[PDB]
Write a protein that binds this ligand. Structure first.
Ligand SMILES: Nc1ncnc2c1ncn2[C@@H]1O[C@H](COP(=O)(O)OP(=O)(O)OP(=O)(O)O)[C@@H](O)[C@H]1O
Ligand SMILES: [Mg+2]
Lengths: 55, 388, 234, 48, 55, 232
């Protein structure tokens, strides 16, 4: 009986690991995008600052 | 208009306790040695130790603080002054700073009034103020650089005037010289304008002799001291600060509430680290508590290590200290902590600058870790650790 | 101060940094064409010091309770100004740079500090005995400084080891938080009555608190606070 | 602090370092033979 | 061994997942900074034209 | 030298015992009747020394680099003369007796010899890193000389006997042939560029050449030269 449930628990954990891997990969995506947008935004707001100081 | 140098200080009643902090940008300086506008803090070291580096870093950090930096070089070689002015020009800090050069090749008459002239510009900023970034600024930062050479030049002038020498062949009025020089740097009360003039004199000592005449005089007259250990600098900790003995009598109240709130337990833990420095020699003879304290102290001291020409905003300062002092960095190995901090500050500049601005405009509250700022910061640090 | 003293009112005098006074005298004398005396000081340092200090006297008409402050040039206690001040005092307090850098903010050296009123007839037999014991302790420590620095702790005898441990405990216990120190120290100020101080030091000297680690004596008031902190630490 | 009394202190402490320098290595030499004797005695204890 | 296998597989998948999340975030961060470097380089050039108009 | 510097040329200035210049100035001031200063030195120490040694700068037209010998009075680096000399110094070299007792003519003590310009911002990150690693391993070497003399090399732990062996190899590598010594030693001098020096020392530190003994590094140039010697 212990072998059966342990094998079942292994399947649940490995499925949970894939489930855990799903959002960890997912959360990286918006952190990838949201960092990108601000980096562009930071570059842009600095860009006008360079332009206005030139004027 | 011209301001007369060699004038009496404003006076006692014409003063107010300092309340507005000065953001130096160095973790150790801004954490353990708070600096307020209008205070007098000493940066003392042993020759090539980093005093000039600390001064120029402080000047660089004050780009958007409504600040008027003053750097007066006494007896410095032309090459050093040229390097300093070039460094200031590179970072754009040159637009708001005035540099007075009194170099070694120049006569002994110079290097004797140059700090007084710099103090005159400081007093002009005090009373009248100037237009900076579209706003009137009346707060000025002055760095007199090496005062030991100023005292040397004054001794030369006195001896050439055949005045009787005193202790260490110095004229007996050298204490009066430096006192009248630095006492004019003050924090005026509202009814005389409310301006401020923070003074950062620099002293060069010999073999870490803090018991010499001029060093003791300047320690006495100034409010706080920043002892720069040569051994620590040679050990790799470039912002070499003798945290055990360096202290600022004033400015603890003139510190942002978040900064002190996160730095009090920092100072406590670093004190525990210094106390346990003797016990670090034993191997496997220390319990879990002492070993954890040693690891924490090493982590925090490596965190204090900050590269040159890298000022850090106060919000980043407090975020990093909250990260380090809430057991969130115990997993990080010590040698990688500096690059971890660099990556984390980059993360905040890229992922959650909104957390940064929230900290910035919530730094004036009595309690720093406000539920939203605390939570937000905890979520951000957990996300960054997940990315790591 | 003299006007209020002469009418009988008690006067609390706090003259600060008389060394600045004597330094200004030295500067003005040097500017006056007088010869420098010793290290550039005025020839009439003793006369001026007497003229100022002798006016600070409690008389039969009224009493002046005066605290004076003296700055030592560099760290030289043999400088003429502190030496001249030394002979005009009833109680002497010496603050040492080493004690200050050892985080002992009071920084008072018990061995270099004396007082004329330290008499069992005046202060009490118990207080006098406690003070003498607290001086002989740390006198042994000053004697054994070189040995502890070079050979180490083990070379001392058992009684010598106990005396050294009690001396370090005493010097740490001398630290005390101040109500005006809240600006840079989070430790709340403590006011310890002289009777409480005598009781605490006598209890420590008897042997009580020997098992307590020395670090628990730092930033503490009476011995009861140390005992409470140790109990909290369990 | 008389520029000569310190000289005697320097000479005395320099002697102390020299004496302790001899002390450090003589114990080390006896340390080597003590460890050697331990190794030689090990088979007798281990075998029984 | 099955329980030991479950623990190892659970950690191995999680370690792989955290690796992939770090990798893709690094791609976005490196892609964004060069874009910011391009914009900052672009910002400088337009300022360069501004002084030439002033001359 | 200023005439040559005005022509755009780079000039090396060699001053023998600048402390003798300091004492000459002190005697001149004493003869003039000026008051003594802090040792009995001249009151115009800083001014006199600043009139000198300040014309030695790198101008846009040309540059003059000065190599000045210094005698320390007694052994006091805190004496006003050596301290003032240090106030206008950018690099230090300390030749040592024992290093030259062994036939290493460039007997530069690595620990004592320092330089202000030794920072990543000027010489590059790689140069600073390799210099710091060399200093660390040599410091470990001199620290463990005590243990080696007391108990021997066998007591040294693993990865530590490696450090002492590598330190001996690298300190024998410090030797370099000199073209002015070609006739005396019968060995042509080798000019090692700074980039080549940094690369060779990095490739010595990372692990290459460990199989090569302490020899074949003596009187050598770049790591390519020692490899060529080992092969033959
Ligand atoms: N945080 C730092 N990171 C890296 N290098 C540093 C740092 N602080 C100082 N240095 C280096 O230390 C050296 C000495 O710096 P600095 O000029 O400030 O010294 P000082 O103690 O003020 O005295 P001096 O003016 O005599 O050199 C320089 O080479 C500088 O680059
Ligand atoms: Mg400097």
């Amino acid at each position: 009986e212990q072998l059966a449930n342990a094998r079942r628990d292994y399947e649940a954990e490995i499925a949970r690991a894939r489930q855990e891997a799903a959002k960890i990969v997912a959360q990286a995506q918006e952190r990838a995008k949201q960092q990108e947008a601000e980096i562009i935004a930071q570059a842009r707001r600095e860009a006008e600052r360079l332009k206005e100081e030139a004027r | 208009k011209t301001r007369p140098i060699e004038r009496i200080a404003p006076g006692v009643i014409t003063r107010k306790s300092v309340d507005t902090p000065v953001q130096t940008g160095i973790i150790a300086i801004d954490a353990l040695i708070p600096i307020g506008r209008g205070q007098r803090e000493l940066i003392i070291g042993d020759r090539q130790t980093g005093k000039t580096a600390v001064a120029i870093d402080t000047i660089l950090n004050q780009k958007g603080q409504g600040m008027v930096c003053i750097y007066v070089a006494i007896g410095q070689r032309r090459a050093q002054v040229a390097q300093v002015v070039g460094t200031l020009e590179r970072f754009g800090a040159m637009e708001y700073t005035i540099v007075v050069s009194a170099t070694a090749s120049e006569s002994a008459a110079l290097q004797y009034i140059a700090p007084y002239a710099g103090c005159a510009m400081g007093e002009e900023i005090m009373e009248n103020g100037v237009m900076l970034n579209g706003q009137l600024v009346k707060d000025a930062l002055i760095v007199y650089d090496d005062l030991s050479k100023h005292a040397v030049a004054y001794r030369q002038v006195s001896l050439l005037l055949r005045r009787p020498p005193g202790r260490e062949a110095y004229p007996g009025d050298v204490f009066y010289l430096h006192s009248r020089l630095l006492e004019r740097a003050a924090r005026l009360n509202e009814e005389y304008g409310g301006g401020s003039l923070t003074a950062l004199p620099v002293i060069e000592t010999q073999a870490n002799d803090v018991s010499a005449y001029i060093p003791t005089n300047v320690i006495s007259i100034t409010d706080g001291q920043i002892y720069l250990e040569s051994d620590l600098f040679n050990a790799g900790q470039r912002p070499a600060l003798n945290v055990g003995i360096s202290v600022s009598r004033v400015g603890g109240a003139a510190q942002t509430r978040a900064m002190r709130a996160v730095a009090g337990k920092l100072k406590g833990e670093l004190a525990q680290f210094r106390d346990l420095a003797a016990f670090a020699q034993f191997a496997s003879d220390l319990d879990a508590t002492t070993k954890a304290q040693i690891e924490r102290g090493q982590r925090l001291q490596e965190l204090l290590k900050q590269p040159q020409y890298q000022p850090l905003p106060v919000e980043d300062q407090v975020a990093v200290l909250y990260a380090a002092t809430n057991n969130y960095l115990d997993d990080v190995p010590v040698p990688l902590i500096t690059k971890w901090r660099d990556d984390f500050l980059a993360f905040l500049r890229t992922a959650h600058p909104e957390v940064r601005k929230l900290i910035y405009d919530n730094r004036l509250d009595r309690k720093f870790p406000t539920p939203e700022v605390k939570e937000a910061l905890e979520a951000a640090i957990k996300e960054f650790k997940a990315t790591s | 101060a003299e006007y209020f003293r002469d009418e009988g009112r008690d006067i609390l005098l706090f003259i600060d940094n008389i060394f600045r006074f004597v330094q200004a005298g030295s500067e003005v004398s040097s500017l006056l064409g007088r010869m420098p005396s010793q290290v550039g000081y005025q020839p009439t340092l003793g006369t001026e010091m007497g003229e100022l200090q002798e006016r600070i006297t409690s008389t039969k008409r009224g009493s002046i309770t005066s605290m004076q402050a003296v700055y030592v040039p560099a760290d030289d206690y043999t400088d003429p100004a502190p030496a001249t001040v030394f002979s005009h005092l009833d109680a002497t307090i010496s603050l040492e740079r080493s004690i200050a850098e050892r985080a002992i903010f009071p920084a008072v050296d018990p061995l270099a500090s004396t007082s004329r009123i330290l008499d069992p007839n005046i202060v009490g037999e118990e207080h006098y005995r406690v003070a003498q014991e607290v001086k002989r302790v740390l006198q042994r420590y000053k004697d054994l400084k070189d040995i502890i620095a070079i050979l180490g702790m083990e070379e001392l005898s058992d009684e010598d080891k106990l005396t050294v441990q009690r001396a370090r405990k005493i010097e740490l216990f001398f630290s005390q938080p101040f109500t005006v120190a809240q600006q840079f120290t989070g430790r709340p100020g403590k006011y310890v009555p002289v009777k409480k101080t005598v009781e605490s030091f006598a209890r420590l000297l008897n042997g009580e608190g020997d098992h307590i680690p020395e670090s628990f004596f730092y930033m503490q008031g009476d011995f009861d606070d140390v005992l409470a902190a140790y109990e909290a630490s369990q | 602090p008389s520029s000569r009394e310190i000289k005697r202190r320097i000479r005395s402490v320099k002697n102390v370092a020299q004496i302790t320098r001899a002390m450090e290595m003589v114990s080390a030499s006896k340390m080597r033979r003590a460890q050697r004797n331990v190794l030689a005695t090990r088979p007798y204890a281990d075998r029984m």
